[model samples]
Target: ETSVYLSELEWKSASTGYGEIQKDASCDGNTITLKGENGEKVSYDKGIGTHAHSEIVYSLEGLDYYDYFETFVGVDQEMAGTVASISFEVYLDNEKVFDSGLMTGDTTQKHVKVPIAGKNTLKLVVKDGGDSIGSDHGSFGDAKLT
Candidate 1:
């Protein structure tokens, strides 16, 4: 199957609670290091990193043949010892497709897959988990469309 990493795509637009979203790196422009609930570092080579209250839009205008989109969502390890809570969401156009509930530094990275048969656009969002947005370094690790 043909797979394309989301970081390799040109995003239509993006907004974040803190600084600008990063490609293949953390919001602070560091390595995209993530940790599981067990507190072990997770390795990944590709990702889109952003802070909470973030939204990234990508055009799927002529890519209906792509069957689905997948990614590993979590909080970056840079905030491992901090109070960072975030929620991940995926949308096809304006319809919510995947919600990761609330994730914290103590939570494992979640594997997400959702059908994208005829979607016109894809939106990746990260929200502050019912709290302040400090240290909420969220990541979509190895995000892809295939």
Candidate 2:
């Protein structure tokens, strides 16, 4: 069962096998699973960041180029007065695929999706442009692949 659950975002589903979908109803607490679909399974466990940034990485298994892809990132912070940017980077087979800019003061449970290639390596990095790790300057909800 190979699956990539990153919320209700858009997915091409070109690499299908068997899987289930679930949501995080607890506001910002959820698990993004991307394994058990193909003949083998690849698992990824990404947690919160150090008040200033967070990151996640997964294997790019069976991704076809024509197939579009999406990534949903949920962010929240109580830190004010300081500017924080939300950014992301995509890598395939240890090569750069895409990179995103950081967004500060963005508190709407944001989600982003984009086209990708099929490889054995994948990565996502999110950094909050802040000075310190304070409740008012740092926070992270979750990250997932689709």
Candidate 3:
């Protein structure tokens, strides 16, 4: 199956809790990098980078050929030493399909894969882990549709 990077698509709507959204980079304009609790680092070459309290919506109309959406969700490595905690949600046509409960900088990146066939819309959201939005840098690493 052919793969399409999410960053290459034009999002219907995109917003973030702080700063501008980035494509294939961190919100601070660096390479997309995530760290595990034990200092394991992972870099991504593609995907959207945004902050907590963010929402990115893409129209899936006429794109039903894509059957799956995949990505890695996590707090950016830049916030490793800070209080960066966030949660990720995937909504297919406004119906919640996947939720990355609560993630901190110390948490490993979560690999997410959800069915998108026949969906009309794809919405990705990130929340501030029920706390303030401080250091809530988050990333959708190597997000793609296949």
Error of 3 at 5 (Å): 0.8
Ranking according to TM-score, highest score first: 3, 1, 2
Judge candidate 3 at residue 72 and give its lDDT.
91
lDDT of 2 by residue, 3-28 (tens): 34433233223110112222332112
Candidate 1: tens digits of C-alpha lDDT, residues 50-96:
99999999999767768989988999988888999999999998899
Per-residue lDDT of 1-146 in model 3, one digit per residue for the tens? 48888888899999998889999998887889886446788989998899989999999886788889999999999888899989999999979999989998889888889999778999999999999999999998899998
- Candidate 1 clashes between residue pairs 3 or more apart in a chain or in different chains: none
Model 1 residue runs over 4 Å out of place are none
lDDT per prediction?
Answer: 0.89, 0.37, 0.90
Clashes of each: 0, 11, 0
Pull out the clashing pairs in model 3: none
Candidate 3 TM-score over all chains jointly: 0.95
